[PDB]
């Protein structure tokens, strides 16, 4: 399956916390594919969990069966630093089928590209952008809609009998 752990470890020193992450990696994950890891860095977290105002941030993007969670979830408390850990199963996050759908991905690219052109014009280098058109409504309809409009399945019928048809 595809899970995503976000580990939190104390801010002692980078290499030894990396070793802790490696230990936490090879011990658990009963059955697993490649466990690619990142390193978001040291950040000063808002609320001092355990009176701790620092932490190394790691992110794991592994994938595997549902059994990969139980030992890790238990090993975490049985572990050292591991202030927090969240296994965000991305097959249940708020929007995953659309993210896998190819057309929506390609559709998102043109909007990214197209939206960026508008923002540029608004914030022109120095010449005044009189339109300041962004949030406001657009011009006439998107002719492509009128052109590419669907055709309902128009069932064709054939005549058989008649009598008195004013027609």
């Amino acid at each position: 399956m595809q899970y995503n752990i976000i580990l939190l470890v104390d801010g002692s020193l980078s290499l030894e916390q990396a070793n802790q992450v490696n230990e936490k990696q090879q011990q658990t994950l009963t059955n697993v594919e490649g466990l690619q890891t990142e390193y978001l860095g040291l950040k000063e977290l808002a609320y001092p969990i355990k009176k701790q105002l620092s932490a190394h941030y790691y992110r794991w993007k592994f994938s595997g069966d549902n059994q990969s969670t139980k030992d890790f979830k238990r090993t975490a408390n049985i572990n050292k630093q591991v202030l927090r850990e969240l296994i965000i199963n991305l097959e249940r996050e708020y929007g995953y089928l659309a993210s896998i759908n190819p057309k929506k991905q390609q559709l998102a690219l043109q909007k990214r590209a197209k939206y960026d052109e508008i923002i540029a014009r608004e914030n022109n280098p120095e010449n005044p952008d009189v339109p300041v058109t962004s949030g406001l409504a657009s011009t006439q309809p998107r002719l492509s809609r009128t052109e590419k409009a669907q055709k309902p399945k128009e069932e064709l019928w054939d005549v058989v009998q008649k009598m008195g048809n004013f027609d």
Binding site: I6, L8, L40, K43, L45, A46, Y47, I49, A55, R59, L83, R84, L86, I88, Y94, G95, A98, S99, K104, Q105, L107, A108, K111, R112, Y115, V132, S134, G135, L136
Partner: protein, 78 residues
């Protein structure tokens, strides 16, 4: 510091993610974006201020509450 811009539109602004068609929210991909939707007093702004649609507002709320648990954002002023 000072408010970015006024409601140049109608009495409402516009859902950002809908124009960009972002379609997906990850807390370490648009983290700085989510602090905008959050009010200065560490409180989730309502629709009138945040400007997103119900889905993106609901999506951002779940992500922000998830971020609150990962200890990356404040929880209240005082």
């Amino acid at each position: 510091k000072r408010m970015v811009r006024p409601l140049f539109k109608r009495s409402k602004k516009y859902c950002r993610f809908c124009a960009i068609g972002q379609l997906r929210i990850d807390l370490i991909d648009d983290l700085e974006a989510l602090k905008r939707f959050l009010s200065p007093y560490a409180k989730i702004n309502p629709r009138r201020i945040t400007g997103n649609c119900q889905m993106h507002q609901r999506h951002v709320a779940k992500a922000l509450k998830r971020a609150r648990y990962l200890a990356l954002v404040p929880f209240v002023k005082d």
